[PDB]
């Protein structure tokens, strides 16, 4: 699992 703030991709 890579670390991502989930802000500019569709995180849903």
């Amino acid at each position: 699992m890579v670390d991502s703030p989930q802000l500019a991709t569709l995180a849903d």
């Epitope: 703030p5 802000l7 500019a8 995180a11």
Partner: antibody, heavy 108, light 111 residues
Framework: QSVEESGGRLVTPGTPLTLTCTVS????????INWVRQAPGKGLEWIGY?????NTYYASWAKGRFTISKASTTVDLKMTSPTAEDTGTYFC?????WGPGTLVTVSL | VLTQTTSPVSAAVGSTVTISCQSS???????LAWFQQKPGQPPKRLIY???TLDFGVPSRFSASGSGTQFTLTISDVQCDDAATYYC?????????????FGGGTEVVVKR
């Protein structure tokens, strides 16, 4: 689905205050959570986030002043040593999902 | 630093507005989003991945860009679009902050 912040209130400078983001309708195991804030009248400011792994990341200006952590259903934002500059609304969330915000006041 | 069109931008109902977002440092991948905020209310995302509309968002909204130039276009401006618009980008952590918001651009409805 949603999130909700709480714990904002008036405190004196230096009083280590913690805010809480409560997840509902989704999982912290598959989702990341961000803390954002806004001084009254000013613009939005990114503070930091916590990945699904548990790894925290912070804005340069926020390092030392702020600490994020997560339990099973909640994410905390510990303010280490608040000053009057820290007054504002604080929002938790990611992407689509943002709470109504909780209002922190720092003053004597 | 993400720098945005200087507030306010005023436009009449039915008109078009365009808001720029310029980065002093190139944005990661094409990981940029556009948010709308009305006073007292939390931010709502309009665009993610630079071009892609979120679910439930009016087709009046459009966006483009890459590297260090991004643009949000509001066609057929409605009274409903009176708000402040913020761009947000990803960057390499260990060169700069992972995430940054722009300064925000306020939209006024000409009347």
């Amino acid at each position: 689905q949603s999130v909700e912040e709480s714990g904002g209130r008036l405190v004196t400078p230096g009083t280590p205050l913690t805010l809480t983001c409560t997840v509902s309708g989704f999982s912290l195991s598959s989702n990341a959570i961000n803390w954002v804030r806004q001084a009254p009248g000013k613009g939005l400011e990114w503070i930091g986030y916590i990945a699904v792994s548990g790894n925290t990341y912070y804005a340069s200006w926020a390092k030392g002043r702020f600490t994020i952590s997560k339990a099973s259903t909640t994410v905390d934002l510990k303010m280490t040593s608040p000053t009057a500059e820290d007054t504002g609304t604080y929002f938790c969330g990611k992407s689509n999902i943002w709470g109504p915000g909780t209002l922190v006041t720092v003053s004597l | 630093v993400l720098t945005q069109t200087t507030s306010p931008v005023s436009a009449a109902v039915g008109s078009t507005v365009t808001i720029s977002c310029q980065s002093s440092q190139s944005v990661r991948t094409n990981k940029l989003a556009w948010f709308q905020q009305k006073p007292g209310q939390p931010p709502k995302r309009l665009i993610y991945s630079a071009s892609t509309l979120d679910f439930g968002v009016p087709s009046r909204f459009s966006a483009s860009g890459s590297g260090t130039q991004f643009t949000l276009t509001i066609s057929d401006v409605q009274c409903d679009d009176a708000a402040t618009y913020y761009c947000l980008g990803y960057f390499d952590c260990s060169i700069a902050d992972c995430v940054a918001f722009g300064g925000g651009t306020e939209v006024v409805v000409k009347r």
